[PDB]
Structure 1
């Protein structure tokens, strides 16, 4: 048994598992299957730990998984995460979004701006206006209007009608559909569907 060749085969298989789990995570996020999403995230994250060297395509895949994980935790309070990074989950999604190797097109800008405003609005929704102001300071005439909105607890100001949580989720889901189509043909899902259509 050649240990080098066994390690190489384990790396090929981890690459296949990563693409399959990204695909599974994308569909669970699109479908709103929260429990399936957290189980798939736990699996993808553990599989990622077994990899030491990543290609450009694999890095893009792990950062898409990290970004969707932060978006899904957008309205959830995680004590240890807040003490370690000193920022909120949507602010962490914003850092990943602005650093992924991808085209900065119209959809990219729309998603970026929707996350920026929702990082403040989710704090107002939870009743933490002091935190809403701290988020605003870390991210940012337009600024003076946004600061007056937070200060007046004007959570339902018309500005948030265009820059809503539902609009942020819809734009991100449209991006997820492109990722889903690009990976729909990856080895593991393709072979698994072949077994299903033959059964039957």
Structure 2
């Protein structure tokens, strides 16, 4: 056997596993299956360690997985919160900055502050505000008054953030629905049955 060709076949298989695990992670995020999401994320992280060179498509795939991981840890080394880390990934993925991209960005920006207020950590809420940001003075007064349920926070809500992110996830899910591993697996299941 040729060690070089074996390593190449392993890299091809790792690429197939990555797309399958991104698909699975997307579905688990959409369905709210927390434990399944946690398990798929762990598998994705481990599989990604086996890849040392990634194409542009594979980089988008791993950054979508990292972004969803941060969003899922939103209410739970970097010196920033998970939602701030999701914002950094979101603003750096090679993707179009369309209307949906902007809506998700602004929702994460507000929720990075609101999740701290929901948890009763108002000093952290002001620290998140300072790192991200008359609009600013209005938002700072709201945080300062612990006005967690202000109409601004109710419009830029956690539920609205999750709904917009789930709409984006449906596009990723559609784009990867035909990838090799899930497609071959669905054929085996349809043949049974």
| TM bucket, shorter chain | over 0.9
Q: Does 1:193 align with 2:191?
A: no
How far off its partner does 1:159 sit?
Answer: 0.2
CA–CA distance in structure 1, aligned partners of residues 119 and 25 of structure 2: 27
How far off its partner does 1:193 sit?
Answer: 0.2
CA–CA distance in structure 1, aligned partners of residues 11 and 189 of structure 2: 26
Alignment RMSD: 0.3
- Number of residue pairs aligned between Structure 1 and Structure 2: 193
CA–CA distance in structure 2, aligned partners of residues 161 and 47 of structure 1: 39
How far off its partner does 1:68 sit?
Answer: 0.1
Match of 2:95 among 102, 118, 122: 102
SS in structure 2 opposite 1:185? coil
Equivalent residue number for residue 181 of structure 1: 174
How far off its partner does 1:90 sit?
Answer: 0.1
How far off its partner does 1:161 sit?
Answer: 1.4
Equivalent residue number for residue 43 of structure 2: 43
TM-score (norm 2): 1.00
String of CA shifts for 1:56-94, please: whole Å, max 9, x gaps.
Answer: 000000000000000000000xxxxxxx11000000000
How far off its partner does 1:24 sit?
Answer: 0.2
How far off its partner does 1:110 sit?
Answer: 0.0
Return 5+ residue gaps in structure 2 as ranges: none
TM-score (norm 1): 0.96
CA–CA distance in structure 2, aligned partners of residues 181 and 147 of structure 1: 40
CA–CA distance in structure 2, aligned partners of residues 163 and 24 of structure 1: 28
How far off its partner does 1:109 sit?
Answer: 0.1
String of CA shifts for 1:132-156, please: whole Å, max 9, x gaps.
Answer: 0000000000000000000000000
Return 5+ residue gaps in structure 1 as ranges: 77-83
